[PDB]
Structures are given as C-alpha cells and as structure tokens.
Amino acid sequence: EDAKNIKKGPAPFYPLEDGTAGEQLHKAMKRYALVPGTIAFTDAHIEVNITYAEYFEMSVRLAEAMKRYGLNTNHRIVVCSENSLQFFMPVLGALFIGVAVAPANDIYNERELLNSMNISQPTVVFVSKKGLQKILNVQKKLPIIQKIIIMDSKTDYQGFQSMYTFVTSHLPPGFNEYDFVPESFDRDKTIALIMNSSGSTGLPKGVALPHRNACVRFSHCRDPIFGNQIIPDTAILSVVPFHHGFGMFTTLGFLICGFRVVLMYRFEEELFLRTLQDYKIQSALLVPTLFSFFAKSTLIDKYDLSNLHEIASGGAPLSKEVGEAVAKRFNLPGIRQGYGLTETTSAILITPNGDDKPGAVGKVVPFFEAKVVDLDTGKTLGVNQRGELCVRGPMIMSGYVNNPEATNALIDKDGWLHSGDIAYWDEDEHFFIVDRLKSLIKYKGYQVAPAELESILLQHPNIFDAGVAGLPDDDAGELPAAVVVLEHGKTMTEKEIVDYVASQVTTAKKLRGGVVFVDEVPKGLTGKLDARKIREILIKAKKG
Numbered sequence: 001e002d003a004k005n006i007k008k009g010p011a012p013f014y015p016l017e018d019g020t021a022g023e024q025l026h027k028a029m030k031r032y033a034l035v036p037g038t039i040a041f042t043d044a045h046i047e048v049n050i051t052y053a054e055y056f057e058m059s060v061r062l063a064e065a066m067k068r069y070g071l072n073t074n075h076r077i078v079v080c081s082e083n084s085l086q087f088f089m090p091v092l093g094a095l096f097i098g099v100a101v102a103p104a105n106d107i108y109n110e111r112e113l114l115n116s117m118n119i120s121q122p123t124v125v126f127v128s129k130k131g132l133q134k135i136l137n138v139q140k141k142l143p144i145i146q147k148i149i150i151m152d153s154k155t156d157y158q159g160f161q162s163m164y165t166f167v168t169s170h171l172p173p174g175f176n177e178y179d180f181v182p183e184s185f186d187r188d189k190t191i192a193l194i195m196n197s198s199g200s201t202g203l204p205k206g207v208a209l210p211h212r213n214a215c216v217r218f219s220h221c222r223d224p225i226f227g228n229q230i231i232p233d234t235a236i237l238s239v240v241p242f243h244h245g246f247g248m249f250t251t252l253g254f255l256i257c258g259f260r261v262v263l264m265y266r267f268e269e270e271l272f273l274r275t276l277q278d279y280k281i282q283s284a285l286l287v288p289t290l291f292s293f294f295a296k297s298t299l300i301d302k303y304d305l306s307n308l309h310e311i312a313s314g315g316a317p318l319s320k321e322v323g324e325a326v327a328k329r330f331n332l333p334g335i336r337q338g339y340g341l342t343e344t345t346s347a348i349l350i351t352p353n354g355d356d357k358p359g360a361v362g363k364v365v366p367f368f369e370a371k372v373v374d375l376d377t378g379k380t381l382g383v384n385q386r387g388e389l390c391v392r393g394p395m396i397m398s399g400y401v402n403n404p405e406a407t408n409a410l411i412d413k414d415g416w417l418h419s420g421d422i423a424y425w426d427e428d429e430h431f432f433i434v435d436r437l438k439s440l441i442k443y444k445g446y447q448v449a450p451a452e453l454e455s456i457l458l459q460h461p462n463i464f465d466a467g468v469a470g471l472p473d474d475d476a477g478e479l480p481a482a483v484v485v486l487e488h489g490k491t492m493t494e495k496e497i498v499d500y501v502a503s504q505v506t507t508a509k510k511l512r513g514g515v516v517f518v519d520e521v522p523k524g525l526t527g528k529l530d531a532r533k534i535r536e537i538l539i540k541a542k543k544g
C-alpha cells in the first residue's frame with residue numbers, strides 16, 4: 001500500500017468548469033466572436049482567414065440545421081477530411097447538440113474506412129471532395145447512412161449538398177446564431193468523439209470519449225503550467241492531423257483559448273520559416289518526423305522569429321539530441337512534450353511550463369495518476385525502475401465501442417489503463433518513455449529496446465533515418481537488426497554500421513542482425529515506426 005510510488009497530478013489552477021464540452025466551446029467562441037478582428041483559423045498556403053465570428057455563426061447554423069434535420073443524442077456523424085478551414089465546423093456543430101462525432105482518417109483505404117464507419121454507425125457523413133468516392137464505395141454496406149454532405153464546397157457538388165446548402169435547407173426564417181442555445185445533456189454519458197485507435201494488430205477500434213473528457217482537456221489547455229496562458233493576439237502553427245486525438249484536442253483547446261490556429265498541409269523548410277515570421281507564431285505544434293526538415297537549416301537567422309517562444313512536439317519519440325539542438329537554435333528552453341493515447345483523450349503527461357528536462361515527456365497532468373508496474377507480476381515499481389506505464393483519470397475513455405472485452409483487457413476495475421509502453425519516473429517525478437512493450441527484442445532472455453539503438457544510429461552523420469527490430473534466428477530467438485536510410489552523399493556499409501553500433505553498446509545490445517538500406521523508414525502520420533513492416537523488410541537480409 002505504498003502511495004509514494006504513485007505519481008499524482010497537482011490540483012488544477014482553475015477548477016473544472018461546468019457544462020458539456022459543447023457548452024464550454026459555445027461560450028468561449030461566442031465571447032471571441034464578439035471581439036472584433038479575432039481570427040480562428042488561417043490557411044497559410046492560400047492566405048485565407050476565418051474569423052471567430054464566421055466560425056461561430058457557421059457552427060451554430062450547422063447545429064440548428066442538424067437538429068431540424070432530426071439528429072439528437074441517439075445519432076452520430078462522421079467527419080472525413082484532410083486538414084482544412086472547414087474541418088471543425090461540423091465537429092463544433094455536433095458538439096453543441098450532443099451528436100457524437102467520429103473523425104475518419106482521410107487516407108484510410110476503403111477497408112479501414114468501412115471499419116471506422118461500421119463502428120461509429122453514422123447517420124450523416126461530412127466528407128471533403130477528395131474523400132467522396134471512398135465514402136460512396138463504402139456507403140453501400142452501411143444503410144445507416146442517410147445523408148452525405150460535402151465540406152469543401154460552396155454549392156451543391158456532384159449531386160450532394162454542401163454544408164451551406166444543407167444549412168439553407170434546414171434553417172428557419174430569420175434564424176439568429178447569437179440567440180442559439182446549445183443543448184444540455186449528461187456530460188458523462190453523452191459521447192463527444194469516437195476516435196479510431198492506432199498501432200495495435202487488427203482493424204482499429206472505436207474509442208468512445210464523453211464530453212467530460214473534453215471538459216478536463218479544457219481545464220488543462222488554459223492551465224498556466226500544463227497548458228497555454230490565454231493572452232489576446234496569440235497565433236499557433238499546427239501541422240498535426242485533425243482526425244487524430246493529438247490534432248483534435250489541441251485544436252479544440254486552442255479555440256477555447258481564443259488562439260489563431262495557422263495551418264500548413266505541405267511542410268517545407270522555407271514555407272515554415274515564412275509562416276512563423278509573417279503570422280508572428282508564438283508556438284509551433286509538430287510531430288517529430290517534421291524536425292529533420294528544418295533542424296539543420298541555414299535560413300533560421302534570416303527570419304524574424306522574435307515572436308516564437310515555443311516548439312511543442314507529440315505523438316511519437318523525439319530524439320533527445322535533435323530536440324536539444326533545435327531548442328538551442330531557436331533560443332528555446334526545450335521542445336515541449338506531451339504524451340497520450342487515443343484512449344486517454346489527450347496528453348496525460350505534459351512538460352510543465354518552466355520545468356523542462358531533456359528527454360522526458362513531462363509530469364502527470366491534473367486529475368490523473370500514473371504508475372509503473374512489473375511486466376510479469378504487476379507490482380508497482382519505485383523511482384527510476386522500468387516497467388509498463390499505467391494511468392488513470394477522467395480522460396480515460398469510457399470504452400471501446402461495442403467491444404467490452406477489449407475494454408476490460410485494457411482498463412482494470414480501479415480505472416488504470418495499461419498503456420503498453422515501457423517508462424520510468426525520476427526523483428523529480430518526470431516520466432521517460434523507453435519503448436513500446438510489444439517491440440522489445442529477446443536476445444538471450446534479456447530485453448533490448450529498439451529505440452535506444454535507433455537513437456544511436458541516428459547520431460551518425462551518414463545516417464538520415466533508422467528503424468530497429470528483431471530478425472528471427474533459432475539461436476538467440478531474435479537478433480537485433482536495422483533498416484537505415486543514409487544521408488544524401490554518403491557511403492556507409494553494413495559492416496561499419498554494426499561496428500559503430502558495437503562502439504556504444506553492451507553485449508546483447510549488439511546489432512548482430514545486419515542492415516537493410518532503404519530510401520525511407522516506414523512511419524505513421526505522427527511518425528511511430530511500423531515494427532511489423534520493419535520486420536517484413538528484414539527478409540531480404542535473411543536471404544543469402
């Protein structure tokens with residue numbers, strides 16, 4: 001019964017607000033829409049702005065239109081789109097009236113899209129042009145779908161209503177957005193978002209997240225230590241996908257704060273620096289796969305970045321060395337980190353403002369607790385000991401949609417979620433993520449972490465990107481091996497790469513598995529490495 005080994009989150013600076021997530025969003029955005037010149041979203045590519053006034057008015061119109069159409073808390077809508085200025089209009093609209101929103105990944109193949117909508121069971125589908133065809137090819141197998149609406153069109157498009165013509169079909173005469181009152185409902189039992197889970201074998205799952213979870217996020221995002229201070233005329237640059245929890249709940253919190261969310265979809269070094277300069281960006285929110293595009297640029301000094309105070313990263317490991325280098329080049333105290341799972345709604349470990357520690361992902365957020373347990377007996381471990389990370393609090397998902405068995409396998413009766421990650425916490429209660437548990441390698445009954453070897457590989461100059469896994473061998477079970485994309489203009493050989501690896505490792509950690517040179521390492525949208533795909537590639541090196 002040792003609670004000295006359970007890391008607890010401090011009390012929030014602000015007490016948790018009442019109301020549904022829709023009510024808190026509506027309140028904040030109405031306030032900002034009544035302040036002249038407030039911009040909610042800016043497309044940095046085409047240089048188009050949308051004010052909080054227009055965004056509020058259109059979200060309210062969508063809420064009333066869906067309500068008049070007949071949607072209520074028994075229904076769900078899908079939002080299938082690349083990032084854009086229109087993404088959050090139907091999301092906010094649905095949140096205002098208690099309709100659950102299921103974002104479907106825009107780059108899903110039709111099979112994965114069918115899975116997502118089979119779980120969410122949407123009545124109405126909001127889809128960009130780029131995604132329409134896939135929706136159609138899937139729609140035949142989901143009779144629950146009664147209405148398809150195009151998001152990035154002003155007129156009807158190819159026989160489908162756009163959000164504007166839909167709204168016009170259902171709004172009453174003389175409707176005034178500022179007299180609209182969002183629906184009230186049980187914030188613990190009404191689902192706000194159904195997100196799709198990642199990483200795990202098999203088809204993704206439906207992660208049901210009630211309004212309560214969004215409300216706790218809205219506590220965090222305006223917290224002076226675990227969030228961002230609400231100061232007028234603040235611009236954020238976001239390059240994170242909106243259908244994913246990392247894009248969803250950061251962007252929602254940014255709206256709660258009245259920030260200006262500046263969007264890039266194609267990431268290039270010079271366009272990034274121009275955008276930071278011209279929009280006076282104070283914080284850039286990134287995934288680590290984008291860092292290489294500017295970490296060693298020579299242009300940084302040619303741009304005025306005096307407004308830039310923060311670079312935040314999330315969704316996957318960020319190299320300590322890359323992070324320290326980038327933080328020092330932009331005069332930053334560090335790269336701010338956030339760790340979360342789709343199943344925890346958002347980051348439940350955040351680097352607190354003013355308390356950076358390089359290589360860590362932060363401390364436990366308010367309302368949450370975290371522990372590290374033994375992989376074989378589940379016993380809680382103590383300081384600086386590695387084990388599985390467990391977390392519990394009011395942003396844990398209510399459960400997987402129609403899958404109670406998976407829910408109970410993930411979350412125990414005390415509410416602890418078993419993250420699947422190896423971590424530890426230090427004397428000051430900072431957490432470090434070591435690796436994914438299902439990606440450890442067994443040399444001779446000793447656990448080798450592929451992330452450590454990757455970081456070492458990544459040190460090298462001739463090595464642009466690396467991914468490590470296990471190649472199967474009847475001796476040792478699996479030997480550790482790599483997949484290496486080299487820097488342009490480099491000659492490195494498998495012999496001298498395994499030798500450089502031997503130079504900074506113990507006995508079992510030696511890369512006795514070889515190297516398979518590649519033109520790119522298989523990553524995900526947030527840049528998690530595809531361990532199954534790396535093992536797959538590690539077959540040509542199994543050949544003779």
Ligand SMILES: Nc1ncnc2c1ncn2[C@@H]1O[C@H](COS(=O)(=O)NC(=O)c2csc(-c3nc4ccc(O)cc4s3)n2)[C@@H](O)[C@H]1O
Pocket residue numbers: 197198199244245246250312313314315316317318336337338339340341342343345346347361419421433436526528
């Ligand atoms: N920060 C991190 N550092 C190292 N590894 C990280 C990581 N985050 C996720 N991971 C990995 O993603 C897996 C979780 O996978 S997941 O399905 O895709 N869910 C997520 O990745 C997820 C949901 S929310 C969220 C974040 N919200 C934020 C808000 C602010 C901020 O500054 C950073 C973040 S991250 N990330 C983790 O288990 C882990 O392996």
Ligand SMILES: C[C@H](O)CC[C@H](C)O
Pocket residue numbers: 017018019020185186187188
């Ligand atoms: C306080 C909140 O707005 C109401 C949610 C309860 C559970 O109905």
Ligand SMILES: C[C@H](O)CC[C@H](C)O
Pocket residue numbers: 047049278279
């Ligand atoms: C605030 C204004 O919209 C920025 C315009 C320049 C071109 O970025």
